[PDB]
């Protein structure tokens, strides 16, 4: 069989030049889950241009300068995390792929997280001034608590431990941005910036699959390690999440300082930390109570919260 005596180009390029290269085979698929994910993320393609946030101007102009600045700062902070994941995180996963299709799916992830980062620009272009925009960028660069979070993850992407790189790749869409995503849902529960929330919901529809897929591939790799190394990787995950929860809490208490949103934002963050663990195959230690947010804010996330007959 050609497949067992050949390597994918990315394997050839970075790991093994002793074998000839095989073209991707979409006709004989190793893992049907890859086809399931590829079909959904490509069929779910969208651009921020096709959501008109001009209809948010009325509700935006009613907000005072402090709230407008909070929104601009929060979203520029999320832009940084998407820039990290698009330019470093998702592309770094390509060479560590178990399957050929996975290599192309992570190329889609990198592009679409790029679209996420671009979408915040579309919102700012419509609502904010040139001064408000540059102020948010200055604020992100000089915010040490903000900078600490991506600075903690990037080393895993550039280092030579594929499993630790994969955990980081799941943690970004699985956890790190939800502290910020609380704000648009909080506002849309008060009928404020409703079209902005439609962009957030399209972003979440991508990130939920990104977290699932990175988590799915992590579980397939760790399952091949000895029981000892599996226990070591589980300890690393809980230790890394503990550290990242610490940095996120520090950041959100500064971000939401004087707005009183930090408590709910952190509970929403921990809710998603629980789902991050579950999609890595580990039990969530968080209770229903300590991950609870206001029903009206959760309603903005989800209102839901061949047949022969």
């Amino acid at each position: 069989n050609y497949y067992d005596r050949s390597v994918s180009p990315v394997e050839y390029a970075y790991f093994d030049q002793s074998q000839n290269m095989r073209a991707i085979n979409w006709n004989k698929i190793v893992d049907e889950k890859d086809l399931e994910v590829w079909n959904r993320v490509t069929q779910n393609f969208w651009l921020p241009e096709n959501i008109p946030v001009s209809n948010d101007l009325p509700s935006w102009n009613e907000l005072d300068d402090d709230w407008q600045q909070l929104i601009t700062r929060t979203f520029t902070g999320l832009t940084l995390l998407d820039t990290v994941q698009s330019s470093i995180g998702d592309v770094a996963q390509i060479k560590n792929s178990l399957t050929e299709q996975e290599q192309v799916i992570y190329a889609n992830f990198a592009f679409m997280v790029g679209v996420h980062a671009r979408s915040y620009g579309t919102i700012f272009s419509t609502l904010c001034t040139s001064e408000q925009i540059e102020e948010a960028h200055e604020w992100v660069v000089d915010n040490e608590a903000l900078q600490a979070r991506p600075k903690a993850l990037i080393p895993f992407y550039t280092a030579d431990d594929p499993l630790k790189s994969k955990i980081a790749a799941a943690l970004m869409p699985g956890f790190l941005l939800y502290g910020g995503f609380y704000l648009p849902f909080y506002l849309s529960a008060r009928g404020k910036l409703p079209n902005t929330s439609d962009i957030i919901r399209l972003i979440l529809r991508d990130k939920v699959i990104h977290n699932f897929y990175s988590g799915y591939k992590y579980q397939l790799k760790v399952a091949k390690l000895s029981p000892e190394k599996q226990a070591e990787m589980k300890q690393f995950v809980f230790d890394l999440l503990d550290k990242m929860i610490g940095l996120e809490k520090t950041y959100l208490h500064q971000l939401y300082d004087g707005f009183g949103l930090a408590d709910e934002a952190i509970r929403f963050s921990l809710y998603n930390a629980g789902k991050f663990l579950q999609n890595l195959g580990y039990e969530s230690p968080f209770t229903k109570e300590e991950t609870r947010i206001a029903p009206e804010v959760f309603a903005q996330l989800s209102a839901r919260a061949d047949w022969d007959f």
Binding site: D31, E32, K33, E36, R40, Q43, N44, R201, L204, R205, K207, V208, I209, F212, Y216, G274, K275, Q278, N279, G281, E283, S284, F286, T287, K288, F298, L301, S302, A303, R304, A305, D306, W307, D308, F309
Partner: protein, 136 residues
């Protein structure tokens, strides 16, 4: 005679949730060439795979094809006491919508909704709801 019929893809999230429950469970096969016969009353537990499609919510593919094939057999259909559905709230208005779709098609109660492999509380609650469903 407490019994669960469930479906789970290769990711085995729904499988792991069901194996934590008290009641005996039977898996609907992933392979579309394979079918099962169930001749005892069961609660159906299934994940959602519509992928947050919008036309308004597009419920196409919410119910996996293997679950449709299973329910299409009227011998299997008649034994369903109710449906529990799973998914992820980050799919928004498409969250766990396999449940409502099956609830409507079968005329059976939507008993519960959960996420991924479920929490301690989900196990506790689903154990109780299944016990009450079979007793009542």
């Amino acid at each position: 005679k407490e019994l669960i019929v469930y479906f789970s893809t290769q990711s085995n999230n729904t499988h792991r949730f069901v194996q934590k429950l008290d009641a005996e469970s039977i898996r609907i096969p992933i392979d579309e060439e394979e079918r099962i016969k169930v001749d005892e009353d069961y609660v159906l537990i299934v994940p959602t795979y519509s992928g947050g499609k919008v036309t308004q919510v597009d419920a196409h593919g919410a119910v996996p094809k293997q679950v449709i094939h299973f329910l299409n057999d009227p011998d299997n259909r008649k034994h369903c006491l109710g449906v529990i559905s799973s998914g992820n709230t980050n799919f928004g208005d498409s969250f766990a919508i396999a449940g409502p779709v099956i609830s409507y098609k079968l005329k059976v109660p939507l008993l519960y909704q959960f996420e991924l492999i479920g929490t301690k509380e989900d196990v506790e609650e689903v154990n109780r709801i299944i016990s009450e469903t079979f007793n009542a």
